[PDB]
Write a protein that binds this ligand. Structure first.
Ligand SMILES: NC(=O)c1ccc[n+]([C@@H]2O[C@H](COP(=O)([O-])OP(=O)(O)OC[C@H]3O[C@@H](n4cnc5c(N)ncnc54)[C@H](O)[C@@H]3O)[C@@H](O)[C@H]2O)c1
Ligand SMILES: NC(=O)c1ccc[n+]([C@@H]2O[C@H](COP(=O)([O-])OP(=O)(O)OC[C@H]3O[C@@H](n4cnc5c(N)ncnc54)[C@H](O)[C@@H]3O)[C@@H](O)[C@H]2O)c1
Ligand SMILES: NC(=O)c1ccc[n+]([C@@H]2O[C@H](COP(=O)([O-])OP(=O)(O)OC[C@H]3O[C@@H](n4cnc5c(N)ncnc54)[C@H](O)[C@@H]3O)[C@@H](O)[C@H]2O)c1
Ligand SMILES: NC(=O)c1ccc[n+]([C@@H]2O[C@H](COP(=O)([O-])OP(=O)(O)OC[C@H]3O[C@@H](n4cnc5c(N)ncnc54)[C@H](O)[C@@H]3O)[C@@H](O)[C@H]2O)c1
Ligand SMILES: O=c1[nH]cnc2c1ncn2[C@@H]1O[C@H](COP(=O)(O)O)[C@@H](O)[C@H]1O
Ligand SMILES: O=c1[nH]cnc2c1ncn2[C@@H]1O[C@H](COP(=O)(O)O)[C@@H](O)[C@H]1O
Ligand SMILES: O=c1[nH]cnc2c1ncn2[C@@H]1O[C@H](COP(=O)(O)O)[C@@H](O)[C@H]1O
Ligand SMILES: O=c1[nH]cnc2c1ncn2[C@@H]1O[C@H](COP(=O)(O)O)[C@@H](O)[C@H]1O
Lengths: 376, 376, 376, 376
């Protein structure tokens, strides 16, 4: 009897570690490789973990991986491919509107967990601009049959973006929009009261964004995804993480801080289904990678740069490594779903820990003469 | 009279420094080269310090140095050698079971402080897997006559490992098991209540483990050895430190934070008794060094890498330098045994101090044009 | 009237900055380039600042610069030279006792502020070992007529060093001894109650000492000079700073934290009056520089290394730059003597400020393509 | 030598106690019997302490005791009396203007330290209202020859009071005004920039004011005198403490927190020179005592009450006890003048200490069956 009715079910479970709530009000600007996740008790293995997540308030996915809408990372090829592996892709807005019209008609008509609708057609998203000339851009791909759109912007709460939500939802109520870019709760309020359906958190944290050093704005991104998902839980709105993703660990860190889908732009760059084409340098196979703020887009200013990244193969051999990396991580946390790991984080059942620079210099590799970092 | 009976024996001993208990609840993730040990009063010299320590609850050793069970660092050669110098070795589990059966029969049959049993045969340990097919692996080396085994696992508290303790101790009660890998108190409870005999603390902190950056799990290791030895003192269970050992100072830091034996994998790599064989690169004598999580072990994922480390000579000329390095350190702390230095740490008689990055950049070498770092 | 008698003399003087007392109990291990000194009101210029300081409780100097007793930095040449510029030199103990006997007889027999005694002979100090065979070393240079000696030791409070003070002061009461190495208050008590005359604070902080990484002992040095001069003010005992001196700013930081004389070993290395001789490497004029813990001194261990430093000219053109660097610093603090700057620090009239790594990366030089760092 | 030039003059002086600056930003609302003053080194005795203080920026007094302008405490009698003992008195404004005109002409025409001007006539102050009909009140006693006036108001920074300063100082520039009532720095700025000459700090803290419980405004008074004298030191403006004075200890606490003169209304009530006349109750000699906010002044509200206090004798036998009580207190602090004790408080040479309720219940009298509290 009394082994049960002193507490009831729960054992002692000592108090070593920091929950996220007292981790992130310390005032430190945390990024991904500055905290990490402490392990706990497991009762399962790596393959029955239900890795489903939500992109908007209605449509949910079999994996939390989404491509970022730039022309140097995704078009209809990787939209097709990431749909067929479970994820979702967007399409950039620096082309003509008929170009993405044809791009969406290519991806829409056209693998067990392939993320298909009630029409059993593959999910497709896109992204539009913010200026009022894009109203003629928007209704064309609305005629093409897009599912979600992303208001790609450097800062979220303009009058322009709020008027675009109040322009879209009273015209196209079944069509669902993504707000962005939101990085605090203060601008997270003005989009949820606008009525937006999900948020896209993170500015200044990309591989190629220098706008933290040019415009002196933004935030560290792992203290941003936490507080935006903290405010956005109050209304049941999922958030989408941008920037600072370099590997598959940061995926799990963004997923355990409240973000439901992780948006990658560099880690999905230099793939077979990425647009453009290859060129060698020092004998290394690579392809170019640039951002919308870079002046290789078109009295200007530049928030992005233009560089290149070495090849990473086809995505159909790449995203199984990423979902297995999320699955082994969610096993070592101790939750057999992403819903359950966000439950354990909001309740405090898993606990984090800070790092120092001396702590991450041991976290990678050290005391070697040379090494061959082979990932899969 | 009254020079004595105001306090009694103890002098004033001013309050400069931080004891470990208020050092490690600051929430900072400390590693070894981020704190250090402040000196105190000595009354002895470097050679009568009784450097004995405990590996499990029954068998104790003349030195706290133990090799790590990987095939790229130890087999029966360095098992023989480190037994004959005082320490203990394990044997990896990525071979056939008859291979370690012959390996244990080679080391068991076969220098004053040579760590021998009541049969006056040398101590030998090993390590097994976790899956239930390893039951046929376990009883074969139990027939060979192993002393301790290590449940080598990335995370400790599975159902599988707890069922292995409850499978072993009711079959082989004199045989003693090592749990692992434990890194918090929360999983330190589920192995001690399972009935495990010692713990192996530290994940993600090796020279070649990238699982802090791949699976986003683990902990900084010097804030891990402290809290696991804090919880494991409550039941009288010693702990074993893994990873992040680069030199002989980190040995003393792990020993002064409550760990009783320090397990090394890279600092004992590239020795004469390490298996494999040498090959030059840039004219530097070196040999390869890889981990079990690396995919040079055999829909996969990789937590380790495969590299190489330059040669460090025979261990019989190497571990006297390591035990003399522990002895000079234990002299400069002010305790003539490791039992007494852990006593002084749990009571608060020695005190630590944090460092900054600017503090360790002076701690090594600086303001030189070139230097020849000669260790012994 | 009432402009005076509300406070009395003192103006408002706002409360921006941190005094040393609340700076150094934060628990951070501060080194020299991690804090700096905030300026205040001046009423003088750089040349009438009385830069006199104290070495022991009796003999005081016209400058706080003292050479460190190693054979690779000082002998009777730089003893003569630094005496003739104001400072004091010691003589290493890794030679035969007749060698320093002749060395002290060379420097003693033999420029306005030349630090001469009541005999009007130049001041000379030395250093002896700790073992009891050095009693025959000690009385020989006592016969030679040395002024102060330094008990050169890695850690201060042995029984051996305390018995050496109780062996010296009852035999040679006018002869004055230097304790060392002390780094906390806890060992600062056992030498002052032994009756030592000054302290030599700092271990593990040299340019060539690796004993923080080998023996895991020591302390960050700018949090060491503060607390040792804090405890040693209570008995009126000056302290001497070792290690971590790279330039002339760290001189002023050690002098403003309570240390009265700054002992340099690398910044006075590679000079004309340093012993040994020159040799080129890559066409750079340089000479070797090694420590007593390095195994180029003679079952061993090594706490120092052996390297080299590029040439810095004659000291008679070098220490005027150092005393002018202390003078401009003491001008910018706002105290026309070193006694007054330690008064302003113990009272709280000057205030410090922490730095971050991002703060010192701007403190040096940045945003240049190349630069020519010319010091004087 | 070196007993001096390590610090310079000052001895160690340990760090027990709290200076006022870190006492009063704790956020606690301190009153007088909630902190107290720790003693220090003395070098004098109780009678040569120069107890002079300042009332305005020009005229200074031989004692810091000033009566409060109510009709139930002071008129021309106690104005004459407290002038002749050193202090200064004001005259209430709830009479006709010709009444205080005659009152000031009685006190002005008319004992060694008797506070007389360059005309060798006794100092006299008064107080006027705030409404614009009081301009005819003001010039009449300006014709009578008053020295200072007090803008008696519940809250200080009205437009009305600032316009009264800008009405007075451009008409009557030699005439000096007192602002009030100020209780924070926020309203202390708007009167000093108005150009007021001293402040009268404290609202809601009187013996008879209930405006903290009626209007929910004010502040605890000993955390008010500190921060108003903190802001008013920046412009060299003295402040005057009201309310919460019950004895002679609170005088010393208000004087050691930066206030230069202490204004009493109840402790100078029930004296021989107080107006009105006596009446017995329970056989106890007493006289009535009421405030301006009480509706025994004339759609109303009431901030004061109307009561009575028992007799305390003539003031010429009473204020020598008060100045001897300030003198013994200033002796036990360790400053031979009030200017020097405010110097020691702003520099931090004296230190305070908080109390608890359990700490003041021992501070008075306890463990007695009865006691006869005889004051002088
Ligand atoms: N982490 C991120 O996602 C991130 C962060 C920063 C920048 N960026 C990229 O930078 C790109 C361009 O940045 P941008 O916001 O400066 O250009 P934009 O086209 O995205 O936004 C338009 C610019 O003009 C303003 N604007 C919006 N509507 C306007 C209207 N009717 N009239 C006049 N001005 C209007 C906006 O403030 C903005 O500066 C974006 O497409 C985005 O992809 C991305
Ligand atoms: N610091 C360290 O010591 C450390 C840290 C991380 C990884 N590693 C190395 O990584 C190696 C492999 O890591 P690993 O744990 O992923 O492989 P493993 O063979 O050690 O463990 C088996 C894997 O499958 C799961 N498992 C256990 N029993 C199972 C069963 N009956 N059925 C199905 N699944 C079961 C486990 O969770 C684990 O992921 C380990 O041998 C270890 O040496 C070491
Ligand atoms: N910052 C510094 O100044 C610093 C710090 C560390 C080391 N060092 C250098 O390192 C040198 C050598 O270091 P060390 O202290 O190990 O050698 P040492 O000769 O200075 O001291 C003797 C060693 O044996 C022990 N000892 C002392 N008296 C003994 C006795 N009668 N019998 C037996 N043992 C005795 C001491 O603990 C010490 O380890 C020192 O000369 C010092 O210059 C300097
Ligand atoms: N600790 C203290 O000293 C203290 C604190 C509170 C109240 N009091 C006493 O309370 C007495 C009355 O308090 P009070 O301030 O309410 O009355 P008041 O006569 O002192 O002030 C006039 C009142 O009307 C307002 N006022 C000022 N000028 C005005 C103007 N031209 N036209 C219209 N309104 C104007 C003021 O806000 C105030 O409420 C005061 O005389 C004061 O002595 C003293
Ligand atoms: O030009 C740019 N300037 C700033 N941010 C950009 C730019 N282009 C793309 N981004 C953002 O950077 C993210 C990709 O960052 P990554 O994870 O480092 O690849 C995208 O999802 C966008 O939100
Ligand atoms: O492949 C791996 N991935 C993660 N950790 C490993 C791996 N192989 C060995 N380890 C751990 O790393 C430790 C050695 O770390 P080292 O002290 O840096 O050499 C071993 O004791 C193991 O616990
Ligand atoms: O061999 C050694 N090991 C550790 N410390 C040394 C050694 N030799 C000299 N030192 C100390 O290092 C100081 C010089 O440090 P520097 O200021 O970096 O040159 C000397 O004053 C000695 O106290
Ligand atoms: O009627 C009133 N209501 C609120 N405060 C008053 C009143 N009358 C006088 N005061 C203030 O109370 C102070 C006297 O407080 P005491 O020190 O307790 O006697 C005077 O100096 C006035 O500032």
């Amino acid at each position: 009897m009394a082994d049960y009715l002193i507490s009831g079910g729960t054992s002692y479970v000592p108090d070593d570690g920091l929950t996220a709530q007292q981790l992130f009000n310390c005032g430190d600007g945390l990024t991904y490789n500055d905290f990490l996740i402490l392990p706990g008790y497991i009762d399962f293995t790596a393959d029955q973990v239900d890795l489903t997540s939500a992109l908007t308030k209605k449509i949910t996915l079999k994996t939390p991986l989404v491509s970022s809408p730039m022309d140097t990372v995704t078009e209809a090829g990787m939209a097709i491919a990431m749909a067929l592996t479970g994820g979702i892709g967007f399409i950039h807005h620096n082309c003509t509107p008929e170009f993405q019209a044809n791009e969406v008609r290519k991806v829409k008509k056209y693998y067990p967990l392939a993320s298909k609708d009630a029409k059993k057609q593959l999910l497709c998203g896109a992204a539009i601009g913010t200026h009022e000339d894009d109203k003629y851009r928007l209704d064309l791909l609305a005629q093409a049959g897009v599912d979600v759109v992303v208001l790609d912007s450097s800062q979220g709460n303009s009058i322009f973006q709020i008027n675009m939500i109040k322009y879209i939802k009273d015209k196209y109520p079944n069509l669902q929009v993504i707000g962005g870019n939101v990085v605090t709760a203060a601008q997270a309020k003005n989009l949820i009261d606008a009525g937006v359906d999900a948020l896209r958190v993170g500015m200044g944290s990309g591989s190629i964004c220098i706008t933290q050093e040019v415009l002196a704005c933004g935030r560290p991104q792992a203290t941003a995804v936490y507080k935006v998902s903290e405010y956005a839980r109050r209304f049941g709105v999922p958030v989408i993480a941008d920037g600072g993703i370099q590997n598959v660990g940061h995926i799990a860190k963004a997923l355990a801080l409240g973000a439901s889908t992780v948006m990658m732009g560099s880690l999905l760059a230099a793939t077979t289904e990425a647009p453009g084409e290859y060129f060698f340098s020092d004998g290394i196979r690579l392809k170019k990678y640039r951002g919308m703020g870079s002046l290789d887009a078109m009295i200007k200013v530049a928030q992005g740069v233009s560089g290149a990244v070495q090849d990473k193969g086809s995505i159909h051999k790449f995203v199984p490594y990423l979902i297995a990396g999320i699955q082994h991580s969610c096993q070592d946390i101790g939750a057999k779903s992403l819903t359950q790991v966000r439950a354990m984080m909001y309740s405090g059942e898993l606990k984090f820990e800070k790092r120092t620079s001396s702590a991450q210099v041991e976290g990678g590799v050290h005391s070697l003469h040379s090494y061959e970092k082979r990932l899969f």
